[PDB]
Each structure stands twice: as structure tokens, then as C-alpha cells.
């Protein structure tokens, strides 16, 4: 039963397995007044005659849109295999550059919230055949990106129903800011809150803090610790593997 460590080969490429296409895109950002990059995983069968859900996957501090793919995440391989095994239905995964910096901008990681919601999401929904409602939109990430997942996801429950912060960093908002209503909206609209981290990670306390608040305030969620895991992709890959399946079970790809 999930969550659990994935079996050997979950992140390996094997002959015959259908592979999705990872495309490179650039979109205009009203948040940075510049063109920004992102990568988009289209499943092996992506057809404009069908509709797909979308997972916005965020990298760590100083990272890039390539981190979750060739940079170590192998998100496309993990997705290809789960799809081939019938573990999850086909879906689209988008990896942006989380540091929306530029002239006139003080904090690019905070500025990223508007970039994602007002520029990247509209670009994706206009160029790809995707659902545009909260029930078909998820957000997850590692470290700094896990913090942004908590921050953006919980303060925008009308946009995301599935949130997966892995090894969330100190940029994670205080509990009072994540749940300004004592967790009311969360208990009603949150379909999946998946918090994971390696037991050896020095940043374990931040995800732990949110976990404790959710326990105290009756917010359902999944809290999974990777035994012996550190601040690396041997925690983040297993994290994504579990999140995709648990989100699927929760209805992310419904229809
Ligand atoms: C904003 O503060 C912090 C961010 C990080 C991010 C780490 C990562 O993305 O791997 C670590 C420690 C911090 O105090």
C-alpha cells in the first residue's frame, strides 16, 4: 500500500515502453516583463482530441526547468513507467524556472507565484488540451520548490486540489499564513496533501511543522518519511513516484 519505496527499475528506461515527449517552451511573463523557459512532458499518446490534467513540478533553490528531467528527477521516465503499468492515467507535467527574477523585482521566488498563476498557467491551457479546473491541477516540488508548493497551493486552494511538498525548505510560510482560516478551506477543498522528506535531511523540521499543525487542526494529509533519505534525488524521485499515484487515486486524472 502507498506510500512505499518504489521497486527497482521505476526510474529506468526499458525497450518497448512507450515514451512521452518532453518539449521546450518559452512564454511571456507579465510578472517579469520577459520571456521565461519551461519544459512540458506530454504522455506517449498525447492527442489534442483528449483532455489531460496538469502537474506543475518545482525545482530547488538555484535550479532550473531541467532539474526534474535530465537534471536528476527523470520525471518523464517515472511517468512513462507508471502509465505503462496502468498505475496512473496519462497526464501532463510542467517544470518551470522557479526564480522569477528580473529588473525591479526584489524576490524572484516570491514573484514566481504571480508568474505561475497569471502567465504560465494561461500559456499551458492555451497551447495544450488540458482541463482548467482545480480538480485537475496539482503542484509539487523539492526543497525550495516544496516550500513554494505549500505556499502557492495552500493559499490558492481554488486552483489546486493536490499538493505535494517534498523536503520543503524554510521559505515555507508560517502556519498562520498557510492556513489563515484555521484550515477551514483545506478541510473542504484539499483532496491530497502529500508531505514527504528524508529522515536524514536537516530541513525535516519545516515539513514536520506543517504536519503537526494539520494534526492539531484536523487536516487530512499523508506524511511519509524516506528512511535513511537525505537531501537528494533518492528522496525526490521516490516522492514523485508516490505522489503521482496517490494524486491519481485522489482523482487528479478523473475522466
Ligand atoms: C529560504 O531559506 C532556505 C532555503 C533552502 C533551500 C534549499 C534547497 O532548495 O535545496 C535551504 C535553507 C534555507 O534557510
Swiss-Prot record:
Q: Which GO terms describe its biological process?
A: xylan catabolic process
Q: Which domain of life is it from?
A: Bacteria
Keyword annotations for this protein, in alphabetical order, are: Carbohydrate metabolism, Disulfide bond, Glycosidase, Hydrolase, Polysaccharide degradation, Signal, Xylan degradation
GO MF term set: carbohydrate binding; endo-1,4-beta-xylanase activity; xylan endo-1,3-beta-xylosidase activity
Name the family. Belongs to the glycosyl hydrolase 10 (cellulase F) family.
**What is the protein's given name?**
Endo-1,4-beta-xylanase Z
Q: Which residues of the full protein are shown?
A: 30 to 284 of 837
